[PDB]
Swiss-Prot record, chain A:
It comes from Escherichia coli (strain K12). Residues 21-38 are annotated as: Primary binding site for RseB. It is found in: Cell inner membrane. This is Anti-sigma-E factor RseA. The record marks 17-18 as: Cleavage. The N-terminal fragment is then degraded by primarily ClpX-ClpP in an ATP-dependent fashion. Sequential cleavage by DegS, RseP and ClpX-ClpP frees RpoE from RseA.
Swiss-Prot record, chain C:
It comes from Escherichia coli (strain K12). This is Sigma-E factor regulatory protein RseB. Keywords: Lipid-binding, Periplasm, Signal, Transcription, Transcription regulation. It comes from the Bacteria. Disulfide bonds: none annotated.
Amino acid sequence: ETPVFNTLPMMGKASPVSLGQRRRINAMLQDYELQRRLHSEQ
Amino acid sequence: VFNTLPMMGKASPVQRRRINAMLQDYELQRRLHSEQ
Amino acid sequence: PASGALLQQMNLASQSLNYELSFISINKQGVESLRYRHARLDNRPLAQLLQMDGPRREVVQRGNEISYFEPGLEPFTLNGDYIVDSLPSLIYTDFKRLSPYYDFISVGRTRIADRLCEVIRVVARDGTRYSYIVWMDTESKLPMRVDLLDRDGETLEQFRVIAFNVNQDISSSMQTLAKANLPPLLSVPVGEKAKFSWTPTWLPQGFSEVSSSRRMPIESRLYSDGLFSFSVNVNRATPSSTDQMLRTGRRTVSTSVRDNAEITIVGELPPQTAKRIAENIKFG
Amino acid sequence: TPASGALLQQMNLASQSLNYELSFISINKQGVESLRYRHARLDNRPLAQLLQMDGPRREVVQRGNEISYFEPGLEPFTLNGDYIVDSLPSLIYTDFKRLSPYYDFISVGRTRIADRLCEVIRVVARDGTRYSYIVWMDTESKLPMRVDLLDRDGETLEQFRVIAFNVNQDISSSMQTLAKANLPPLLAKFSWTPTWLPQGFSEVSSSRRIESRLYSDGLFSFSVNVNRATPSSTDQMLRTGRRTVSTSVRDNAEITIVGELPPQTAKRIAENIKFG
Ligand SMILES: [Zn+2]
Ligand SMILES: [Zn+2]
Ligand SMILES: [Zn+2]
């Protein structure tokens, strides 16, 4: 992994937003994302 | 990865001064005496 | 200065013009090839973010409906005013509301994607956040490059246009999008303004709560300063909890344990800001 | 998979015959560079432009067997050649028929790149002495969408990746301007011999100004420089990306090999030189 040559990054920009002590923070992470999109009031 | 302008780009004109010299001649030589 | 206005123009161009940007997204996970198409038809936006290599992941927008497609998954639609992560948040920002707590500073003009661009920096005034550097096309006013920088000048992420075009009239591919038989809108609670006994005593200048929910109970409070966002989560501490500080590129995760409560901050903030916020939450 | 060789020849032909524009990035440890390559054919004569997209406006153009180099601040000149070097990976301008006797063309399958279904092909020298190439070519236009240069043990040395492109049976207008443009001014037995050369390499030229010889196998090239002086002259090895520079001393002679060869391979050549 030389970030530079990896063309298919983990969790690309077009990845679908997931709906549903480490795995608890993996859930707090994708809940933050879910929220960002449910509240994009531009 | 975030380096927008790599030194020695693709569209650049064809003690550590002996190597960098043989390096520039290699580039000229593969362009002067290219192939096909 | 003229900057603040230039940014409003850049934002306006992004929502008004018909165009296609073929760009790359660079971070520590790699270099991603993407394409973003935007247009307006019958008084509403049309947009598509397409993953160019590998699985055909794709997001589509028609009006306020955001549909997500991924190979081997049931498509689904949500409501939103644009596709998040299709362009940096900076581009979907209302610079007017930001001006009170951000400085817009000019670095000059320079060439990007064979275009002369105005180079502008967007940095919080109370030095508590990540900053942005934006290169915009002097003609179309569209973003050509956008760098998200951490507090020590290092780049966390870069948006870079490799090719693009602006069309006076709508392409046929967007025209079909309007007719597209898009997946059904899903329902998810939106608008909860939950009541909690704990309160974030300190918050950087500009943030405000945009949601409050009690979503194994977790009490989340989402904030946004109009550009950056993060959630403050509180649940009852357990036998083996611990202070934590993880960093996934631009997203921070800071777990702070105090008074039997497990505090966790998640979002686009320097680790130090996230922790200072966590230790200023007053319980009861 | 003999189809592999046929596919590679198709990609070469397409790169030579079509009118098209490729918007790509070039990636190495030194960064990510935004570039644009335009190609066309007017009256059976190739026209092409390689333009640096960000920063200084450096460009290389081609017309017939003439290659012009532009770069603000420096001065324009022209060389003779059949194609612009480093405008696309060497793999594109190579004659697969010639190197078929010492290279294997292996199909890796098909996969999506730049929103196109591509044939994936590995180009490897049978003797295992060189870097290998992996090509992703568009099944429709036959043009290369991605090209990776790899080290003998899988380390990616460099990447060529198309981000956007168009194919136009019709000639661009700016290429018509290049068609009428006035381009800038235009610009040997040795003593020793390399006893070991990877299968397929042949000398193509010689010169001096030190004793230098240029080699090429139709895809990769390197120079073996020999001078007999020694101030601090010492044994060293460096890799500026895909470019290797192996230096060694012996018999009061310094041996410097420069080029597209893995370090081990270069070192072997330096040692197997039989001095006169
Ligand atoms: Zn909301
Ligand atoms: Zn840092
Ligand atoms: Zn299409």
